[PDB]
């Protein structure tokens, strides 16, 4: 990671605030994601043939939103421990790779997330850029690991 | 959960303090777990020929230790949403079941954890009991789901 101290601090500081509100706004993020990206929704076989109102309230969606938040937290906490960061992200990668999810889906989700998070918290463009750069490190690890793995 | 509000609150409060020390103390917990239960150590194949000093400082242990506290956090966060808790714990169960880990190994880890946490934070027996009951909720879901998975 070539993330600077100020970049990592902006992300960590932003995330510290965001994570408390995620418990309530996270499901709405995933609905937004699913509405933009029906192919993303389609990986959640539990949601087959379900109205988006029902998806939004589903414990399965809420669990994934918690899984998302916790994953992101684990990465942000490890930005100064690159070997640990890579192990954590590779474990995420394997699980999603096994479901036929390409890195491109993470890139979609990350791009939407940064905007969603900025709109919520109204943090500055410095902080938005720092998020984008941080999530590009994460996507870089995901993508490279998916290329290592046998389908 | 027959978990009371007071029980859930005691766990959430003690966790809020412990969580923050887990970077400092989590590796030592797993060393103690490995020394107490050699069979638990043996699930971590990358540690077989390693000195325990090497294990303690390894990125792989540190990653599992982070995974452990995040998983526990996710459960504690969800004590008021039992359908969500069950899903989160079922996901854990699948992954570890596939590695041939029985629920008994989680029972051993959980009991050691509550002792370790109490020794560190010096909370009262009410709080220790609330941890034990909370982790029994979790273990019950794990055990049940392993029966399903077969
Ligand atoms: C940072 C982004 C993400 C994080 C941290 C994350 C985290 C997780 C976690 C921890 C799990 C449970 C463990 C497992 O089976 O893998 C999970 C499950 C899942 N994830 Fe993600 N995920 C992310 C993005 C996505 C995306 C972009 C998709 C789809 C394109 C997706 C689809 C799924 C599915 C379908 C499951 C299985 C859900 C279930 O069985 O209930 N995830 N995710
Ligand atoms: C609350 C208790 C625990 C939690 C939350 C937890 C969580 C995790 C998580 C999230 C992973 C990565 C799963 C993945 O994405 O593939 C993992 C891996 C693993 N866990 Fe656990 N775990 C716990 C207890 C245990 C126990 C008791 C053992 C052994 C008895 C164990 C052995 C392993 C092993 C061997 C791996 C694979 C590690 C590797 O080589 O990369 N876990 N654990």
Name the descriptors.
homodimer; 151 residues; mainly alpha; binds protoporphyrin IX containing FE; oxygen binding
Small molecules bound: protoporphyrin IX containing FE
Oligomer: homodimer
The pair of chains with the biggest contact is: A-B, 18 and 20 residues
Radius of gyration of chain A: 15 Å
Q: Quick gist of this model?
A:
Chain B: Keywords: Heme, Iron, Metal-binding, Muscle protein, Oxygen transport, Transport. The structure is a homodimer. By secondary structure, chain A is mainly alpha-helical.
Structure description:
- 2 copies of one chain form a homodimer.
- The first copy, chain A, is an all-alpha fold and 151 residues long.
- Chain A has one domain.
- Chain A has 7 helices and no strands.
- Bound molecules: protoporphyrin IX containing FE (2 copies).
- The site of one protoporphyrin IX containing FE has 17 residues of chain A, from helix 4, helix 5 and helix 6.
- Chain A: This is Globin.
- Chain A: Belongs to the globin family.
- Chain A: It holds the Pfam family Globin.
- Chain A: One of its GO terms (molecular function) is heme binding.
């Amino acid at each position: 990671t070539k993330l600077t101290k100020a970049e990592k601090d902006a992300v960590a500081n932003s995330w510290a605030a965001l994570k408390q509100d995620w418990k309530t706004i996270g499901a709405d993020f995933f609905v937004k994601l699913f509405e933009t990206y029906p192919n993303i929704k389609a990986y959640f076989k539990s949601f087959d043939n379900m109205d988006m109102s029902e998806i939004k309230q589903s414990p399965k969606l809420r669990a994934h939103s918690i899984n998302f938040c916790h994953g992101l937290n684990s990465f942000i906490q490890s930005l100064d421990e690159p070997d640990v960061l890579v192990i954590l992200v590779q474990k995420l990668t394997v699980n999603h790779f096994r479901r036929k999810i390409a890195v491109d889906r993470f890139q979609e989700a990350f791009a939407l997330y940064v905007s969603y998070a900025q709109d919520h918290a109204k943090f500055d463009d410095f902080t938005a850029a720092a998020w984008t750069k941080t999530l590009k490190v994460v996507a870089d690890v995901i993508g490279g690991h998916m290329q290592t793995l046998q389908k």
